[PDB]
Amino acid sequence: EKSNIIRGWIFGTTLDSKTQSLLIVNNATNVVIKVCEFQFCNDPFLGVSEFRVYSSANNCTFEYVSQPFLKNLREFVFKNIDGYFKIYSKHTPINLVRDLPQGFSALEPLVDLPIGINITRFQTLL
Amino acid sequence: QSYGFQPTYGVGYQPYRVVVLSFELLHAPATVCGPKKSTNLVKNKCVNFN
Ligand SMILES: *[C@@H]1O[C@H](CO)[C@@H](O[C@@H]2O[C@H](CO)[C@@H](O)[C@H](O)[C@H]2NC(C)=O)[C@H](O)[C@H]1NC(C)=O
Ligand SMILES: *[C@@H]1O[C@H](CO)[C@@H](O)[C@H](O)[C@H]1NC(C)=O
Ligand SMILES: *[C@@H]1O[C@H](CO)[C@@H](O)[C@H](O)[C@H]1NC(C)=O
């Protein structure tokens, strides 16, 4: 996590006016989860304003609002089973500065979303 | 063609608002339901709980 320049997820199967696509962004206000379909860019840099990640919406099926996801570690698990998407999380300070330390930390589920769309790829934003 | 609506027109030609609601069959996780029950609670008795 540290200096970050992270957060921003773009999932989906197709890349051209087909199916839908998930989108998760953190802005210290709301972790919005828009399944709405748009077109995108290569490296859309928002914030400090400008907003040009999406291109055009057609129609959407889910809108969500929840609380923000806050030597640390930013750990997530994204898993989909029979139309239910599950995103887990964990955040804990560590002493080692090198790599993943030696220890155990289970993941408390944060949300369950019934959607029912097949997914094949994803990309991280900055 | 435009309707002709007047307050003095006949009841058959009077405007009527019709709303038709249609629900799709069970092919996806259920998203619409309703309040079933609002019963109270008891303690230290033999009861059937749901
Ligand atoms: C953080 O992002 C959320 C989600 O995009 C923003 O929530 C919106 O807030 C406006 C303010 O009235 C509402 O009209 C919208 O409906 C909300 N949702 C969306 C999807 O736009 C929130 O405002 C953002 N916070 C900051 C500080 O920019
Ligand atoms: C709405 O969603 C359907 C998904 O079946 C898609 O085929 C269509 O292109 C979308 N847009 C419109 C305007 O119908
Ligand atoms: C695409 O999604 C549909 C939705 O039910 C699913 O039936 C299908 O198996 C998915 N495609 C793949 C390749 O998994």
User: CA of B49: how far to CAs of A30, A94, B18, in Å?
Assistant: 38, 46, 43
Terminal Cα distance for chain B, rounded: 58
Q: Is A114 in Cβ contact with B31 (below 8 Å)? A: yes
Distance between CA atoms of residues A10 and A55, nearest Å: 14
Resolution in A: 3.3
Give CA B20 to chain center in angstroms: 10
Q: Would the CB of A58 count as within 6 Å of ligand 1?
A: no
| Residue whose structure tokens are 């921003």 | A8
CA of B28 to the centre of ligand 3 (A): 13
Asked if residue A94 has its Cβ within 6 Å of ligand 1, the reply is no
Q: Tell me if A81 sits within 8 A of A109, measured CB to CB.
A: no
Q: What is the DSSP letter of A12?
A: E
A117 CA closest ligand 3 atom index: 2
